[PDB]
Design an enzyme around this catalytic site. Structure first.
Site, PDB file in Angstrom:
ATOM      1  N   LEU A 128      37.160  35.878  39.644  1.00 24.97           N
ATOM      2  CA  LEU A 128      37.963  34.742  39.840  1.00 24.97           C
ATOM      3  C   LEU A 128      37.275  33.570  39.200  1.00 24.97           C
ATOM      4  O   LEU A 128      36.039  33.654  38.604  1.00 24.97           O
ATOM      5  CB  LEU A 128      37.596  34.459  41.606  1.00 24.97           C
ATOM      6  CG  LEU A 128      37.938  35.372  42.543  1.00 24.97           C
ATOM      7  CD1 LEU A 128      37.575  35.212  43.892  1.00 24.97           C
ATOM      8  CD2 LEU A 128      39.480  35.593  42.457  1.00 24.97           C
ATOM      9  N   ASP A 129      37.978  32.279  38.986  1.00 26.84           N
ATOM     10  CA  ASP A 129      37.239  31.244  38.206  1.00 26.84           C
ATOM     11  C   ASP A 129      35.969  30.819  39.082  1.00 26.84           C
ATOM     12  O   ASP A 129      35.788  31.086  40.162  1.00 26.84           O
ATOM     13  CB  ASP A 129      38.189  29.970  38.069  1.00 26.84           C
ATOM     14  CG  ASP A 129      39.716  30.684  37.945  1.00 26.84           C
ATOM     15  OD1 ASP A 129      40.067  30.429  36.691  1.00 26.84           O
ATOM     16  OD2 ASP A 129      40.412  30.976  38.934  1.00 26.84           O
ATOM     17  N   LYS A 130      35.404  30.001  38.457  1.00 22.87           N
ATOM     18  CA  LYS A 130      33.924  29.347  39.190  1.00 22.87           C
ATOM     19  C   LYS A 130      34.311  28.599  40.274  1.00 22.87           C
ATOM     20  O   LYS A 130      33.854  28.683  41.345  1.00 22.87           O
ATOM     21  CB  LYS A 130      33.390  28.529  38.014  1.00 22.87           C
ATOM     22  CG  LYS A 130      32.130  27.692  38.648  1.00 22.87           C
ATOM     23  CD  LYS A 130      31.727  26.736  37.559  1.00 22.87           C
ATOM     24  CE  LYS A 130      30.529  25.866  37.992  1.00 22.87           C
ATOM     25  NZ  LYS A 130      29.927  25.149  37.089  1.00 22.87           N
TER      26      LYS A 130
END
Length: 250
Positions: free
Chosen positions: A62-64
């Protein structure tokens, strides 16, 4: 890569897998600009034997600043089986999001993704890029925003954020892909404030469904919509209810 004392929110754990609920401000894997402080570091601290599993059992990311569910393998057999299930599109990875713009239908975005030609921390749709498929449905209409539920077939860099920007519906709060336009005309103080303060992509990994890599039993997990998104959705909902009250009476 070293263990670091970074607490994880473990939703489920058995002999073979861990399901976590990832917060914002947490990178999954070390990279250029993020040598440590990641989920991988946290996993090595939590369960050091995981070092003997490829990529500390991390099979997708997942993205940050995207929140929510990830499945992590604890063992070699589990990691191999999970990777195979992903390759076969046998794991459901479902997302909740809030996108800018009124939208009228669900759909599919099947468009390859590359690094942006001049901005090296941005991705972009490009015909010659890495194939990527996102499916989306409309959960709820707002006045000039839309609540979506999305499912991945692939997991390319910034995939959902890029695909939604490509169709002119970038996610609210996205600091890269155009998530901060002026608030809607006639918006309440509360709506304006909530939008102002919502400073990440409105994206959450809400549900995972898979056949357990060892037992083969079908399993499903959820992560509750985080409070930031709850607040965002509720104010947009209230605004749309005010709008309906202005126009739905003959």
């Amino acid at each position: 890569f070293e263990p670091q004392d970074i607490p994880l929110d473990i939703v489920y754990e058995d002999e073979d897998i861990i399901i976590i609920n990832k917060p914002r401000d947490l990178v999954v894997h070390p990279g250029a600009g993020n040598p440590d402080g990641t989920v991988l570091n946290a996993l090595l601290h939590y369960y050091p034997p995981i070092a003997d599993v490829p990529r500390a059992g991390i099979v997708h990311r997942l993205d940050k600043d995207t929140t929510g569910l990830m499945v992590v393998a604890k063992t070699v057999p589990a990691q191999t089986r999970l990777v195979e299930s992903l390759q076969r599109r046998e794991i459901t990875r479902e997302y909740e999001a809030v996108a800018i713009g009124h939208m009228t239908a669900g759909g599919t975005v099947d468009e390859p993704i590359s690094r942006h030609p001049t901005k090296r921390t941005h991705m972009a749709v490009h015909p010659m890029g890495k194939p990527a498929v996102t499916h989306y449905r409309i959960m709820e209409h707002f006045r000039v925003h839309t609540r979506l539920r999305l499912r991945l077939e692939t997991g390319r860099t910034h995939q959902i954020r890029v695909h939604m920007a490509h169709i002119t519906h970038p996610l609210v709060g996205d600091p890269v892909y155009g998530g901060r336009p002026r608030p809607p005309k006639g918006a309440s103080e509360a709506f304006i404030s909530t939008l102002r303060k919502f400073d990440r992509q409105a994206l959450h990994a809400t549900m995972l469904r898979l056949y357990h890599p060892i037992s083969g039993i079908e399993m499903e997990w959820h992560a509750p919509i985080p409070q930031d998104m709850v607040e965002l959705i509720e104010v947009m909902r209230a605004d749309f209810e005010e709008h309906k009250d202005e126009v739905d009476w003959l």
